[PDB]
């Protein structure tokens, strides 16, 4: 495809964003992979291990709301600008997982309190090795 699927390790549950909304800062949250256009992800690589991830239902990036730099800061989808908020370093855990970690906050892409749940929301925290951390980047 030249798209992905990025699967909590934890849930088994994919990146989304919320109800395929297009709209500058719609909520990115952890849903039941139904292999829809928000759910796929362009990894696009800016060099240096950075990327941008673009959601193939809208063109836009995943975002870390407003650029705050604070555990459990918001993610969201937001047109992109070229932001560090909006580029990711993509790391290999080992173990056929990764972390993504925002550039501007040195903060890992984050399951809130590891909820497996529909809807859970999808925040930036410092990464400390929780399977809510981990994600497994699926060629789709
Ligand atoms: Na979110």
Do not use: C, M
């Not at 370093?89 to 972390?99: C, H, I, M, S």
Request: glycine share 12%; aromatic share 10%.
């Amino acid at each position: 495809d030249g798209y992905y699927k990025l699967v909590a390790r934890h849930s088994g549950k994919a990146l989304d964003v919320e109800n395929a909304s297009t709209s500058d800062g719609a909520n990115v949250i952890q849903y039941s992979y139904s292999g829809g256009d928000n759910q796929q992800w362009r990894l696009v690589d800016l060099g240096d291990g950075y990327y941008k991830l673009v959601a193939r239902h809208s063109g836009k990036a995943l975002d870390v709301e407003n650029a705050s730099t604070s555990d459990g800061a918001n993610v969201i989808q937001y047109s992109y600008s070229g932001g560090d908020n909006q580029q990711w370093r993509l790391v290999d855990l080992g173990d056929g997982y990764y972390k993504l970690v925002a550039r501007h906050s040195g903060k890992a892409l984050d399951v809130e309190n590891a909820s497996t749940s529909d809807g859970a929301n999808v925040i930036q925290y410092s990464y400390s090795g929780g399977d809510n951390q981990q994600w497994r980047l699926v060629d789709l």
